[PDB]
Ligand binder design. Structure first.
Ligand SMILES: NC(=O)c1ccc[n+]([C@@H]2O[C@H](COP(=O)([O-])OP(=O)(O)OC[C@H]3O[C@@H](n4cnc5c(N)ncnc54)[C@H](O)[C@@H]3O)[C@@H](O)[C@H]2O)c1
Lengths: 823, 207
């Protein structure tokens, strides 16, 4: 259905008639299939710039008496439904949470035969933790009929057990502040059908049919169409007794009025009984058209079924009638989603879904666009209204009301509707609606909170990190495909803000990610989409850091190739506080050298003399490494500054130990001697001198290496929590805390896990918890190894040696004399 | 072709491709079998090495006095090593390591090789050099060997005419990509290359 921007706005205005929900289903259970039925039926089209489909808009219309059955405030017959896209595998736990956090309802798909799988159960558990209301659809009924050839009663009992399993999970993990939220077929919160053939139904749909021909309000009718209600065909009487007077078995209403009609069609059509089919179709008033009237077998069955019981209608029915609106849901979701006081003005504004109050917009993810390499901020307005041009407070993850850390007060370019793959600019957007934002991707990496109050805290933050802790070397198998790989890496880097493609000094094409799985799919996307050429990929390697933890035993000295220039320097460790400050923007390279110096002196115990003489950061001109000018009366010193800085950028990117980046390394230039003539002190002369002096100084300051460490957060039922510790105990894991969700048997375990111990971690955790555990890990900190990297037998040295061999370097780490002036 | 048998030879930061000590030993032998003799090393940057090995040594304008113009090599690789690198950074300030090249001349040119104790490229030595080669500078189909600077290494200057008759092949001595500006480590010089690096005996007197 095509709509104009005006109609969309009028639709987003009545937020009581909006449905924010997602689909919880295993890929193998026709998740995408049922989703297709919805978009092909109620998908909203709009009467240039494309994006990666993140959300879909659906429109549903109902009757005055249909709306009356809705137990929440409503306004009109029109309904706007936001179908939020979700990951295909639970391994993508971080983005599973992101999807659920911006939703209020959930369509849970389960299989007829296999019932509820372990994955779906785990995800549903998380959804309930977010206080999300579920509606269930039992999919793949076709298999029970065509393959298993079950009886009507068998099929019924199968559904009953399925519904029972689901409600055991619901009653256990649903929050008590929501009331009875279990699903009941007789109440219309459970649908049955087959996405494959495109048909589905609810008890309410059949209740509407028989309501008339039984002279009964459909309320009482559908109460009978499930459970122990029996209509005696001989007496034309209703009963709760499954036997007549003579003790003969009675068929339940569900089997008689619902399953029987379906079973009869399946039997008539699939057995090619050309004489029955017509009579059977007229009976149910199923009209075919020309070409369709010649079909047979599955072909005919698919056409008859999907026009007899259109799948999308059954689903939309439940969604509109039973899934909560933003107004209803936010009333009990606010506290949970606000990392601050519950009686705050903003938290209250979220409970009331107040369009007038201060803006409270949640950014769940950044979406790749065709507008160059820019990303659009995808999220949801919980309070106030977002407007094009409106200047907002962009609060990053580490932001806290009081400090100005992780804060950016900028203006929103354009507010846009995210219609799947397309974008539609609009003026404003009231609270309760999902929306996209333009011109924020340079202040938000992924997640964040947008406000307008100078006292508002962040909303429940989703931990993320861009730090590339794992990487691989990418190489083409056929040398002619080189150009295709070059542009492939270029566009892989644009499809995700957390992916990193660069070139080492040796020319290698490097691809770095945030985790094993993350890097895995990136290399799959690269070899099939962004490049498409056969690739030679090396085994995954963990990124390390080179550091020093003491001052250079002696002054480092290095001469230029022409022997006319000398640099005297000394290396020393930088405090972790300072390194963190630099990585957190507190100490900024782009900052006023005097304002920055005051901060380092006052808050970090630096000599403001030194702090004012910072020449550069590194690597990339912003890393946790510094060059301090501590020379006295050196002529033309400023004329080599650009060369010294350049040398530092290369020195800090690939250290002398084994080619890894430096961290927390401070270099003090003590003295410099230069040739009077500028011809003999250019870049070619100074750069090598500075680099080698830096190396010499580094190796004189007892070198060390640092390893990346994850912070892991795991949800898991008390019963299987034991497996979590079993796995951590052989991964050098370190338990931070164990907390239990009050009332439920769900435990949250947080622990530190070395990145080089995390390979195949989710697989082992899966194995050890029966798939009950829900892993979630983000880069936390760097950890210095105690062992000596210069010792080939030690833990650190063992790592070094392996890397050096792998890079074709000389096995033994070079001595400082190698880079020191040869004399 | 004087590069021996194997794959396509190329120059890289990672080192000279398809060039083992064994292949060098074959290329060297086949050179001598054709009346060529080794006269020293030339260190330069990667693109220059590609130019020299595949296009040949070609005369060009260099930054010195006209009378001393020519192709400069060194008997000791350590000396030539210092020139085996970029002299100019790119936009990002990257200074790559270069490559050591072996220089061969026809033996028919040996009668034009002279040696001196004076320091070359200096006005005080111009007279003695012009005496030995039997004609005014610059050097032509002749060469001069002497200290590059007082009390320093010996350097050889091949007159441009002679330089353009050389055959230049890669050395099995690598430059260090992780120590650009460092000195040649004697331990990194293949023993089997050292064995074929003897220099000819140069004349101390006029022809
Ligand atoms: N380069 C050496 O190995 C070496 C040896 C002894 C002494 N030196 C000293 O270095 C100074 C000159 O250095 P240089 O000779 O390397 O630079 P140069 O200025 O004399 O010559 C310029 C560059 O052109 C390059 N080149 C590229 N293609 C070429 C080609 N086809 N033919 C010839 N050259 C080509 C050479 O590598 C050389 O580096 C001399 O004054 C001498 O004192 C150098």
């Amino acid at each position: 259905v095509a709509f104009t921007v005006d109609q969309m706005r009028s639709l987003m205005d009545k937020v009581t008639n909006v449905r924010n929900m997602s689909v919880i289903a295993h890929v193998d259970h026709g998740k995408s299939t049922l989703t297709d039925s919805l978009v092909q039926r109620a998908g909203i089209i709009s009467a240039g710039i494309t994006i990666k489909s993140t959300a879909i808009s659906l429109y549903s219309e109902m009757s005055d008496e249909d709306v009356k059955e809705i137990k929440q405030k409503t306004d009109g017959n029109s309904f706007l439904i936001n179908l939020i896209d979700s990951p295909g595998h639970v391994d993508f736990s971080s983005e599973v949470t992101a999807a659920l956090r911006v939703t209020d309802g959930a369509l849970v798909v389960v299989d007829t035969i296999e019932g509820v799988c372990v994955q779906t159960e785990t995800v549903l558990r998380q959804a309930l933790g977010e206080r999300i209301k579920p509606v269930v659809v039992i999919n793949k009924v076709d298999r029970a009929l065509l393959e298993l050839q079950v009886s009507k009663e068998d099929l019924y009992q199968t559904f009953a057990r399925t519904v029972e399993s689901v409600n055991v999970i619901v009653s256990t993990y649903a929050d008590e502040v929501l009331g009875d939220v279990q699903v009941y077929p007789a109440r219309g919160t459970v649908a049955f059908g087959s996405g494959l053939h495109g048909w589905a139904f609810t008890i309410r749909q059949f209740a509407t049919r028989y309501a008339k021909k039984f002279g009964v309000d459909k309320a009482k009718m559908m109460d009978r169409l499930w459970g122990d209600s029996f209509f005696n065909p001989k007496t034309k009487k209703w009963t709760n007794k499954d036997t007549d007077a003579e003790g003969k078995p009675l068929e339940r209403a569900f089997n008689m009025f619902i399953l029987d009609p379906i079973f009869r069609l399946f039997t008539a059509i699939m057995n090619f009984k050309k004489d029955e089919i017509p009579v059977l179709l007229e009976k149910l008033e199923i009209v075919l058209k020309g070409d369709e009237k010649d079909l047979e077998g599955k072909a005919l069955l698919k056409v008859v079924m999907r026009k007899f019981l259109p799948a999308a209608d059954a689903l939309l029915e439940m969604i509109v009638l039973h899934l909560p609106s933003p107004v209803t849901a936010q009333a009990y979701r606010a506290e949970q989603l606000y990392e601050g006081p519950a009686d705050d003005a903003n938290c209250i504004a979220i409970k009331n879904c107040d369009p007038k109050a201060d803006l409270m917009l949640y950014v769940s993810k950044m979406v790749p666009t065709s507008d160059k390499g820019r990303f659009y901020a995808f999220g949801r307005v919980f309070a106030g209204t977002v407007k094009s041009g409106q200047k907002v407070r962009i609060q990053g993850p580490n932001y806290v009301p009081g400090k100005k850390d992780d804060l950016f007060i900028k203006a929103i370019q354009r507010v846009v509707l995210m219609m799947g793959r397309f974008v539609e600019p609009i003026d404003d957007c009231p609270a309760g609606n999902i929306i996209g934002l333009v011109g924020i991707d340079q202040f938000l990496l992924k997640t964040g909170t947008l406000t307008t109050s100078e006292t508002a805290h962040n909303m429940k933050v989703m931990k993320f990190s861009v730090s590339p802790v794992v990487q691989v070397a990418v190489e083409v198998k056929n040398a002619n495909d080189l150009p295709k790989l070059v542009e492939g890496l270029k566009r892989l880097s644009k499809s995700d803000p957390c992916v990193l493609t660069y070139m080492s000094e040796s020319g290698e094409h490097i691809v770095a990610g945030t985790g094993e799985l993350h890097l895995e799919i990136c290399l799959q996307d690269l070899e099939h989409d962004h490049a498409g050429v056969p690739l030679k990929i090396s085994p995954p390697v963990v990124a390390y850091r080179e550091t020093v933890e003491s001052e250079s035993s002696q002054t480092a000295l290095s001469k230029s190739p022409n022997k006319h220039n000398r640099i005297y320097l000394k290396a020393e460790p930088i405090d972790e506080e300072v390194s963190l400050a630099i990585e957190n923007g507190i100490i900024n390279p782009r900052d006023d050298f005097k304002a920055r110096a005051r901060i380092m002196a006052d808050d970090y115990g630096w000599d403001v003399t030194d702090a004012r003489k910072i020449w550069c950061f590194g690597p990339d001109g912003n890393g946790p490494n510094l060059v301090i000018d501590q020379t006295k009366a050196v002529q033309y010193l400023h004329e080599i500054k650009d060369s010294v800085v350049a040398a530092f950028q290369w020195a800090t990117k690939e250290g002398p130990i084994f080619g890894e980046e430096m961290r927390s390394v401070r270099v003090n230039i003590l003295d410099v001697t230069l040739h009077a003539d500028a011809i003999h002190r250019g870049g070619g002369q100074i750069i090598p001198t500075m680099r080698r002096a830096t190396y010499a100084g580094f190796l004189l300051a007892d070198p060390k290496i640092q390893e990346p460490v994850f912070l892991v957060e795991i949800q898991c039922p008390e019963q299987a929590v034991g497996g979590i510790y079993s796995v951590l105990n052989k991964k050098r894991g370190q338990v931070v805390s164990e907390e239990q969700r009050p009332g439920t048997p769900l435990f949250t375990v947080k622990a530190y896990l070395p990145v080089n111990e995390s390979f195949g971690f989710t697989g082992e955790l899966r194995q050890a918890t029966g798939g009950q555990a829900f892993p979630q890990m983000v880069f936390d900190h760097w950890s210095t190894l105690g062992s000596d990297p210069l010792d080939p037998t030690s833990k650190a040295g063992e790592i070094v040696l392996a890397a050096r061999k792998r890079h074709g370097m000389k096995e033994e780490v070079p001595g400082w004399q190698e880079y020191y002036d040869k004399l | 072709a004087f590069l021996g048998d194997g794959g396509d030879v190329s120059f890289s930061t990672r080192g000279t491709q398809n060039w083992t000590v064994e292949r060098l030993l074959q290329a060297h032998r086949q050179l001598e079998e054709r009346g060529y003799v080794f006269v020293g090393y030339h260190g330069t940057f990667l693109e220059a090495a590609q130019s020299i090995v595949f296009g040949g040594v070609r005369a060009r304008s260099q930054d010195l006095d006209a009378i001393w113009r020519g192709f400069y090599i060194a008997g000791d690789p350590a000396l030539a090593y210092g020139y085996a690198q970029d002299q100019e950074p790119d936009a990002r300030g990257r200074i790559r390591n270069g490559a050591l090249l072996r220089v061969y001349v026809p033996r028919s040119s040996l009668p034009g090789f002279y040696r001196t104790s004076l320091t070359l490229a200096a006005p005080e030595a111009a007279g003695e050099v012009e005496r030995l080669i039997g004609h005014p500078l610059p050097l032509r189909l002749d060469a001069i060997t002497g200290p590059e600077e007082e009390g320093g290494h010996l350097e050889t200057i091949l007159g441009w005419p002679l330089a353009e008759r050389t055959v230049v092949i890669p050395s099995a001595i690598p430059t260090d990509p992780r120590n650009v500006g460092g000195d040649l480590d004697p331990s990194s010089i293949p023993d089997k290359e050292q064995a074929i690096s003897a220099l000819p005996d140069y004349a101390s007197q006029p022809g």
